[PDB]
């Protein structure tokens, strides 16, 4: 499924395909936002790593399974 | 109904169709804004999940039912 | 009457037609700004709801009746 | 007279014609800025109301009397 | 003389002709900046009034007499 | 592997090829972000040095190994 | 010599020719930045005055003498 | 070697050629960032002076020797 992450004051919108479930990704993101984590880590189906600065996240759209 | 969410310092305006009522969406949004929640969660009619950073919300437009 | 709301750091300028009076809208807006409400709610003549983050308001321009 | 109000981080520059005197408008603006008031209110010659968030004001240009 | 005022996060650069001396204008501006005044007032040769929010000033260029 | 670093309020997105492993780079970045370090330092396969102001980091994309 | 001053969140880059020495200009700038002065004042070879809000300075480039 | 300095909320990316070593430049920059100096000073091979407001630095990219 597609994951789109908008980053405040940054022109690119991160987009990738996740091998995880909508719930797994939602948990990871929610926890980061709820806890002001300061780093959110997501991996895509090919093993690319996105390390995002939680505070700079505008939104995450998790696509349909 | 359409839900449009403007996000401060972000080009994209989030748009989707909700299976919920204007009241349900209004409650979710209002609560987030009123309580400075760290996270607002909205789901659309197809089951796409929008996790929005409440503080970055400019506005929400909730369209008319249908 | 037209209501235009400018939102800081957001391209779009919210515009709608109000079934309310200039005074009603002015009170709702003024109260939000004066009290730093954190949410302002306006409804248009068709029943669209605008939930605006008060702090992000640049201006409101309430048209003539 | 023309009143132009520049708003920080907002593309539109508010412009209108005032039925009031340069001094009246200057007092209303000065007071808002000096007191960090939450809200500045100006009306134009046609009765349009501008409610501006004082803190978001960059400048006001007040035109010459008449 | 020309007075140019740059305003941070605002596209227009205020420009006008002053009937005052470079020193008078410099005094008014310097005082505003030094004291964090919260309002700077300048008038031009035709009597236009510029009320600027001191904190939003990037620079003032005062032209030659 | 490619490393892309997005910098908040800066038009350029830093891109380079790393001689290090995804894990090495991830540790260096994670540490910087988790500790709010004042400075993150990365070197590329040609020996170019990137000194990034941690607080200004939007994201790092680490490419797949090789 | 040329002095270029970049101002954060402002399109224009201030440019002028100084009758002073690179050292004089460097001292004035350094002092302002080091001390978080509210105001930096520079004058050019024709007597134009630049009053800059120190906190809004991105950089100063001081050119070579002549 | 080339030194490129990205400045936050400023279009221009400072570029110059250094007569110093990658290590010298790295120390000067690292020290500024680590200590929140409030002024970083770099000089180029022709004697141009860059006085940069440390807090406004996005990145420095020190080229190969």
Neighbours of A (≥3 Cβ pairs closer than 8 A)? B, F
Strands E40-43 and E13-17 come out as: unpaired
**Contacts for C32-41: CB closer than 8 Å, 24+ residues apart:** C32/C57, C33/C57, C33/D38, C33/D39, C33/D51, C33/D53, C34/D38, C34/D39, C35/D38, C36/D38, C38/B33, C38/B34, C38/B36, C39/B30, C39/B33, C39/B34, C41/B30
Tell whether E38 lies on the interface with D, counting CB pairs under 8 A: yes
> Nearest CA to B52 among B19, B18, B17, B10?
B10
Q: How many CB atoms are located within 10 Å of the residue C14 CB?
A: 21
Resolution at which this structure was determined, Å = 2.9
Tell whether G23 lies on the interface with H, counting CB pairs under 8 A: no
Closest-CA residue of B relative to C58 is B58
Integer Cα distance of E2 and E19 in angstroms = 10
Tell whether H1 lies on the interface with F, counting CB pairs under 8 A: no
Integer Cα distance of D54 and B46 in angstroms = 42
Residues pairing with H42 in the sheet: H50
Q: How many domains does chain C have?
A: 1
Residues pairing with E52 in the sheet: D59, E40
G51: domain CATH number? 2.30.30
> Nearest CA to B43 among B14, B18, B6?
B18
Q: Which of B13, B22, B34 lies at the smallest CB-CB distance from C49?
A: B22
Q: Which of A9, A48, A53 lies at the smallest CB-CB distance from F63?
A: A48
CB-based contact B14 A59, cutoff 8 Å = yes
- Rounded to the nearest angstrom, the minimum Cα separation between G23 and chain E is 22
Total residues belonging to chain E: 65
Tell whether D52 lies on the interface with C, counting CB pairs under 8 A: yes
Are G39 and E55 a contacting pair, CB within 8 Å? no
Integer Cα distance of E31 and E46 in angstroms = 24
Integer Cα distance of B65 and C21 in angstroms = 24
Interface size, chain A vs chain B, as Cβ–Cβ contacts under 8 Å: 62
Q: Which of D22, D58, D63 lies at the smallest CB-CB distance from E56?
A: D58
Integer Cα distance of D11 and E9 in angstroms = 10
Give the distance from CA C55 to its chain's centroid: 12
Per CB-CB distance under 8 Å, the chain G contacts of H7 are: 6, 8, 58-59
- Rounded to the nearest angstrom, the minimum Cα separation between C43 and chain B is 10
Interface size, chain E vs chain G, as Cβ–Cβ contacts under 8 Å: 62
Q: Which of B8, B47, B53 lies at the smallest CB-CB distance from A57?
A: B53
Strands G2-7 and G57-62 come out as: antiparallel
Neighbours of F (≥3 Cβ pairs closer than 8 A)? A, H
Which of F19, F39, F51 should be substituted to probe chain H, the one whose Cβ sees the most H Cβ atoms within 10 Å?
A: F51
Per CB-CB distance under 8 Å, the chain H contacts of G26 are: 49, 51
Alpha helices in H1-65 (DSSP H): 22-35
Experimental approach: X-ray
CB-based contact F58 A7, cutoff 8 Å = yes
- CA D20-D21-D27 angle, to 5 degrees, is 95
- Rounded to the nearest angstrom, the minimum Cα separation between H64 and chain G is 23
Integer Cα distance of A55 and A59 in angstroms = 11
Strands C40-43 and B49-52 come out as: unpaired
Total residues belonging to chain F: 66
Are B50 and B25 a contacting pair, CB within 8 Å? no
- Rounded to the nearest angstrom, the minimum Cα separation between C65 and chain B is 23
Q: Indicate the DSSP class of residue E11.
A: S
Per CB-CB distance under 8 Å, the chain C contacts of B13 are: 12
Q: Which residues of E6-45 are buried (b: 16+ CB within 10 A; e: fewer)?
A: bbbbbeeebebebebebeebbebbbebbeeebebbbbbbe
Closest-CA residue of B relative to A7 is B10
Residues pairing with F7 in the sheet: F57
Range of the domain at E10: 2-62
Interface size, chain D vs chain E, as Cβ–Cβ contacts under 8 Å: 63
Distances (CA, A) of A4 to A1, A43, A47: 10, 13, 16
A–B contact: 3+ Cβ pairs < 8 A: yes
Tell whether F11 lies on the interface with A, counting CB pairs under 8 A: yes
- Rounded to the nearest angstrom, the minimum Cα separation between D64 and chain C is 23
Integer Cα distance of D13 and G15 in angstroms = 27
């Amino acid at each position: 499924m597609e994951v789109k992450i908008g980053i405040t004051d940054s022109p690119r919108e991160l987009v990738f395909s996740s091998a995880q479930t909508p719930s797994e990704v939602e948990e990871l993101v929610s926890n980061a936002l709820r806890d002001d984590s300061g780093l959110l880590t997501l991996t895509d189906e090919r093993g690319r790593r996105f390390l995002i600065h939680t505070a700079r996240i505008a939104y995450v759209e998790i696509g349909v399974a």
